[PDB]
């Protein structure tokens, strides 16, 4: 059987159906509006109502509130409101169809086939892999034939996100460093033949003088990996690549500066930064975006042991700078210090890194937006514009020499791994990373607060969220224009 | 133009009592009143040709046998009920009535200042004071004002996302603390938005720029008086 | 308009409707089963499905899964399963009718009019009093005329509970000691003319030598009250009363042993014990139960101040025993010590007290059951049997001299207010109270873990739960037989 998701707008006499809803109402000789009318209150945005037996092929029709037809970019909220309405409403419709165990659903494009595809595929996603109680996986399809490219591009963007949620969600004993490197490799090679994957072993990592990455890694028995992803999509094979770097800690216990036990299981998602940048690169190659992109993810685990990093140790990063490890839980900093050095080798046009770096970001913006520190207002503008379309917001945070001073604490080393005071922890972790970039166009995104979803963005179940993957794909999309 | 300032003259936390460590700095919880009143004294010394009202609710927040209890529902001047879930989120409560009264004056602009939240300190920690504003015009004038004074301002988001977190019904129209711990500056500001209907309001969270240690060199270590010159400079330029 | 809630049983060909569902299906010429059939999967227990436009008078019909028709008493779970199924299913049906803002609902009795009334009235309850956003309050009515007494007795039992949730939920600055005493007075006097209410002031309380109650009270500015409720429902006016005692702390801050800030707002519900026993007595008088019942609730607030109780103080209870107050947050103990002395004055047949005494009860049984300590297996049996009918369980906990030894710590006093070790805190708080009863039939119910509902019992919204009020009404009901 099929289910049909149909949208309507908020209230004229009648609140308007979409063209597809209106066309369905004519095909059932006015029944759909009749029952909608005797059924109760007008549906508002994100609200659904389900009707049965109106048509032989659609035993379940779910009508969904899209909000005001007029909705556009909201200057205060910094997103396109209308598309947010369409993702929210279609996900709520689709999820009613899966609770009735119906295996396929025709979705009305609602005026924007791309965001309706994104609502349906985000909305229906689940991670029930290691459970014996799995949900019915239903397959969403565009209702109609008129903008199947826009539907399929949304399908594409919502899967990139879903790959990243899956990557993040999987338990750390399953998603080890080589296992993640293998999933990404497999996915990237299915995306395009214009790809190259290098799963670099410890041997290579130590030939590259990556001392601060290697010192995080040694306290675990799990072999680290340096994952080098290439998408050569430019016609000019010598066109300078954009490089994405991502913190891939596959589990963070804290090391010897050990984490509290409460809710420590969420640190399986400390490789969110690698999940995010690698999924956006798989999507860019599926999209055959005409640009060269390198992806760099140092993968390792941070564990207490008799060979772990000790508070006070001084390690040497690939640029020769010494780093005093004052707290072993400020490990991503260390990892990214070498990876951001290596990023420069590629002669990049742009360097963007992503990391679940700091609980300070969560106290600061708590999932309303991911924080970005950038030395370039041009980069800031392109990322900000990219998030107005996706609804997955970005908010700029300061790169002031003020926070740098706080981490240039000599004592034994050139730089300290944690700021001198507790204040502005996101700001001093970003200033730490500035010490390893000499590039005029670098952006640091702190993903820690947008790592999980509970109820905040309606089209995502409660779980690891995969954010800001579509802001990154959209940024690449527009850049390759 | 009306300036409003949190004047808690000492904050112990009430029954949600503060930890003992470094509690002496809450003598500076009236920093918001100190800041807006000093800028108005300076504007009148400067004979700036504008009308300015300053509004500072002054009181102390102490545990006693008549103190506010966690869970109480109080009624603000606009009739909204407010569930006091934590008595240490008191400035919120104080400013809720004062920002109602601010509207009586038919103001061109409403700016309030408060040492509201240690979350601001975790967020920007004295590199800048945080400002939440429903107007980019206000943001631009304040930002420009701080380029001259060196005493920086950094915009922070007023998203309905943080509002949802504080519109927790349970007993009241609004809760006094956000549902989750995340984004505490952002949900305290969204709480205050519930009491303004004015198209040009700015909320400055002064908590992280309250003290100086070594960060801005021309100030000894002590209570810093920030962002007073950004405010005087903003008034200066406005009266041009 | 009306909504109709109709139940069906789990699966024969067809899963069976109730008589009312079956009768409605005949009135719509087979439409209801037809649409039920094309609509999706068979409803299981507590699941609902809503159908629109089957009949002019019922634009919304909500069909609800009752589980197996055969369900009876479950030996492992210690409740009547079937009635639990009916409360759960009818509440879920009724709440669909309120989300559509329909103001009245006909409810199918489902084979047990009493539990269907209880599901509907519990299910629909809300506490939105001080909000400007209130829900539509819908009015549930029995579908039919055949067992309107059973429907109305369930209405009665579910309101007693709802009075107690409301009492518990209200903020402590509104529900002060005289305000609560006034609500209870007003309600009891509407229940019967066979009632007497005494709101005893401080003056009386100090003439009665109630030193340990008075020492909790003095640290707050709010005047304490001793509430004495009488329901003379026996034909023999000299028939010995059953007495119910309840801890009425209207807000507990901890005093000088001050509570942590986190979630302290829930201590507005520390008068749950008074709420519970007073609501059961209002219900017993509405039910014109032929017995004499006295209700005793010491009401006060526990606050830090310059006149509050100090850790180490020795106070004197009404029986002359000294009590060392080692921790001021073990105040209910102190309050109940005088009230349980006074209870003996009444020459009672039975003494039952209820108190949100101990977070140790919550660690022990955590809302699966309220804990009862009783020196009588006869009392235990009657309470246990009473909870098999209501589904609101009771679990016996030990009154061993082992826990008594732990609190007979002399040092300055006859008894200490907290046990010597942290272990068995519910057990040593109950052993403390045993020191003030000389009656052969006393039961202590520790209500702390069943104080709130989140998701655990389906027919209650998330909030203060009013438990175990119907176990108490049911116990009185059977006793007066
Ligand atoms: Zn860490
Ligand atoms: Zn980490
Ligand atoms: Zn405070
Ligand atoms: Zn304060
Ligand atoms: Zn207590
Ligand atoms: Zn208590």
Swiss-Prot record, chain B:
Describe the subunit structure.
Homohexamer.
Locations listed in the record:
Cytoplasm
Domain of life where this protein originates? Eukaryota
Q: What does this protein do?
A: Cytosolic metallopeptidase that catalyzes the removal of unsubstituted N-terminal hydrophobic amino acids from various peptides. The presence of Zn(2+) ions is essential for the peptidase activity, and the association with other cofactors can modulate the substrate spectificity of the enzyme. For instance, in the presence of Mn(2+), it displays a specific Cys-Gly hydrolyzing activity of Cys-Gly-S-conjugates. Involved in the metabolism of glutathione and in the degradation of glutathione S-conjugates, which may play a role in the control of the cell redox status.
Predominant localisation class = cytoplasm
Q: Which residues bind Zn(2+) 3?
A: 27
Which source organism does the UniProt entry give?
Answer: Bos taurus
Named from the GO MF annotations, one term is: peptidase activity
Q: Which family does it belong to?
A: Belongs to the peptidase M17 family.
Which residues make up the binding site for Zn(2+) 1? 11, 88, 90
Q: Which UniProt keywords apply?
A: Acetylation, Aminopeptidase, Cobalt, Cytoplasm, Dipeptidase, Hydrolase, Magnesium, Manganese, Metal-binding, Phosphoprotein, Protease, Zinc
Q: Which residues bind substrate per the record? A: 6, 11, 16, 18, 29, 88
Catalytic residues of the enzyme: 18, 92
As stated in the Swiss-Prot or TrEMBL entry, residues carrying the post-translational modification N6-succinyllysine are 179, 200, 213
Q: Spell out the protein name for this chain.
A: Cytosol aminopeptidase
Q: Which residues carry this modification: N6-acetyllysine?
A: 179, 213
The terms describing its cellular component in GO are: cytoplasm; mitochondrion
Binding-site list for Zn(2+) 2: 6, 11, 29, 90
Biological process GO annotation list?
proteolysis
Amino acids binding Mg(2+): 11, 88, 90
Please specify the portion of the entire protein covered by the chain, as first and last position out of its full length.
277 to 516 of 519
């Amino acid at each position: 059987t099929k289910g049909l998701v149909l949208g309507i707008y908020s209230k004229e006499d009648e609140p308007q159906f979409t063209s597809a809803g209106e066309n369905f109402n004519k095909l059932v000789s006015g029944k759909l509006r009749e029952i909608l009318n005797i059924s109760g209150p007008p549906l508002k945005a994100g609200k659904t109502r389900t009707f049965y037996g109106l048509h032989e092929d659609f035993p379940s029709v779910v009508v969904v509130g899209l909000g005001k037809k007029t909705a556009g970019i909201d200057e205060q909220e910094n997103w396109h409101e209308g598309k947010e309405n369409i993702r929210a409403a279609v996900a709520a419709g689709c999820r009613q169809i899966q609770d009735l165990e119906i295996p396929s659903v025709e979705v009305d494009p609602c005026g924007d086939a791309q965001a309706a595809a994104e609502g349906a595929v985000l909305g229906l996603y689940e991670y029930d892999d290691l459970k014996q109680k799995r949900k019915v996986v239903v397959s969403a399809k565009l209702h109609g034939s008129e903008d199947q490219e826009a539907w399929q591009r949304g399908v594409l963007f919502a899967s990139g996100q879903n790959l990243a949620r899956r990557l993040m969600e999987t338990p750390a004993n399953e998603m080890t460093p080589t296992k993640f490197a293998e999933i990404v490799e497999e996915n990237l090679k299915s995306a395009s033949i214009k790809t190259d994957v290098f799963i670099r072993p410890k041997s290579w990592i130590e030939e590259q003088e990556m001392g601060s990455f290697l010192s995080v890694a040694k306290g675990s028995e799990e072999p680290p990996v340096f994952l080098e992803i290439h998408y050569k999509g430019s016609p000019n094979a010598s066109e300078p690549p954009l490089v994405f770097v991502g913190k891939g800690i596959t589990f963070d216990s804290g090391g010897i500066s050990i984490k509290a036990a409460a809710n420590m299981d969420l640190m399986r998602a400390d490789m969110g930064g690698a999940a995010t940048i690698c999924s956006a690169i798989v999507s860019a190659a599926k999209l055959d975006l005409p640009i060269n992109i390198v992806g760099l993810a140092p993968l390792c685990e941070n564990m207490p042991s008799g060979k772990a990093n000790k508070p006070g140790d001084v390690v040497r990063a690939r640029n020769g700078k010494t780093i005093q490890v004052d707290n072993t839980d400020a490990e991503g900093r260390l990892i990214l210090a070498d990876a951001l050095c290596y990023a420069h080798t590629f002669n990049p046009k742009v360097i963007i890194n992503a990391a679940t770096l700091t609980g300070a970001m969560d106290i600061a913006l708590g999932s309303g937006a991911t924080g970005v520190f950038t030395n370039s207002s041009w980069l800031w503008n392109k990322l900000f514009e990219a998030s107005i379309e996706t609804g997955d917001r970005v908010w700029r945070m300061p790169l002031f020499e003020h926070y740098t001073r706080q981490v240039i604490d000599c004592q034994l080393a050139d730089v300290n791994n944690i700021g001198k005071y507790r204040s502005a922890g996101a700001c001093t972790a970003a200033a730490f990373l500035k010490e390893f970039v000499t590039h005029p166009k670098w952006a640091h995104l702190d993903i820690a607060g947008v790592m999980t979803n509970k109820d905040e963005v309606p089209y995502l179940r409660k779980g690891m969220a995969g954010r800001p993957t579509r802001t990154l794909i959209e940024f690449l999309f527009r850049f390759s224009q």
